[PDB]
Amino acid sequence: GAMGSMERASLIQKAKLAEQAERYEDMAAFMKGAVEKGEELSCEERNLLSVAYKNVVGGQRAAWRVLSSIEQKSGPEVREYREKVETELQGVCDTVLGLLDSHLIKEAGDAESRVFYLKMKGDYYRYLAEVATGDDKKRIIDSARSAYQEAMDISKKEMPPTNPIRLGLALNFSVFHYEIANSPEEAISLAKTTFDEAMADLHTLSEDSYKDSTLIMQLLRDNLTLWT
């Protein structure tokens, strides 16, 4: 790894500089190097990793969607360039999934972090599924579901129903059901159950926590309205 010779603390420092400079590919590379040192990540570091790769993959996804729209409207050039962007996106997703499997998930020291990483694993398989076809797509869909479901099992046992990480996991898993797995019934059931179980506990929360939880509940609601 190109970052193997740099101190962990220097990589974290440079990841934060890269963020300030809006250099998200650099930020991701620095965070990959930090992960590959083999130590657990703090909550702040976990978020740096997620922000960096989300920005990178988000730009690739947006570009892929532009090109796919041009391709559907329509020589081989549009397809070729869409395939080029697609291959780069798959590369980034494979990189993230590799960090999670080697070895962030298994080394996560608490339930919050394990759910955070398993949700991430579901998300990055989901991004692969958006561009996959055929038998490969079917395998990717099963991998996404299994990661999300393990995260769900842990969050139900270890986190309160208003916890924002648990809510965000349920949001993304329900999007997976609807948009990827063609299972609108499962998407609606999951979003609804999550919404109701959080609503029951809103009165126990501080002002800031109430805002956090209702913000994500409203994201669930927006999707329920679209789906219903």
Partner: peptide
């Protein structure tokens, strides 16, 4: 459908 924004 939109996913979690962060």
């Amino acid at each position: 459908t939109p996913s979690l924004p962060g």
